[PDB]
A = this chain, B = another copy of it.
Amino acid sequence: MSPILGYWKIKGLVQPTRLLLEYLEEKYEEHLYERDEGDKWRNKKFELGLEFPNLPYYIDGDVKLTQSMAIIRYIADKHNMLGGCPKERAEISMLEGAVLDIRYGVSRIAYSKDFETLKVDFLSKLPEMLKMFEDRLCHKTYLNGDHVTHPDFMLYDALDVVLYMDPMCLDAFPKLVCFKKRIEAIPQIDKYLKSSKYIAWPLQGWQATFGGGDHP
């Protein structure tokens, strides 16, 4: 029985997890809830055996999990990708948080009716955040070295998003522009992005002022 990954039919908080699964060439099925299926989900919420019911969820022969970060880390952990010692594991967790500051930075304002005003102060702070990654990649191929790790897919997802907000936010960051291409040059990812499973939009929930709607 193939693992089930439930979530809205958007990119949201699970996009990075989808990408890690594709990368590892893991098999899995998806329980996607359409914009109007809110009710279809509420009637199942407390019937799946989840100790902490929420979206996304991940169910397979071994576990039943919720909290998108617990899920991506589990899939990575099952492939010995979380780090070989305390120090390395803390390096990888530091990369997770730094990426989330960016990604969550967008979500916290993408639902306000004053998006444009908020979008201005945000983009004034985004640069400092990007440059930390720009330097981290000065001599590395990927965030943790020569081998891909899950924070790589999270960062990719964050760049894909801040680029919709502002197509020029990476002009001063060549290594990040390259990092983004390099992730797409990975065989498994390129296949996925061109397959029928890829969900290109929306970025956030359909009702958001930014990254919302049924079409780009």
Question: Which residues of A line the B interface, CB within 8 A?
Answer: 51-53, 62-63, 65-71, 73-74, 77-78, 86-87, 89-90, 93-94, 96-98, 108, 132, 135-136
Contacts and interface: CB of A to CB of B under 8 A. Distances in A.
Most B CB within 10 A of own CB, among A52, A94, A108: A94
Contacts of A66: 94, 97-98
How many copies of this chain are found per oligomer?
A: 2
A64 to B, nearest CB: 10
A89 to B, nearest CB: 6
Contacts of A94: 51-52, 65-67, 70
16 contacts: A51-B94, A51-B132, A52-B132, A66-B97, A66-B98, A67-B96, A67-B97, A67-B98, A68-B97, A69-B97, A71-B90, A73-B89, A73-B90, A74-B93, A77-B89, A77-B90
Given A74-B86, A86-B78, A69 B93 contact: yes
Nearest to A79: B86
A106 to B, nearest CB: 14
B77 A62 contact: no
Contacts of A132: 51-53
Nearest to A128: B53
Contacts of A93: 67, 69-70, 73-74
Nearest to A97: B67
Contact of A77 (B74, B77, B86, B97): B86
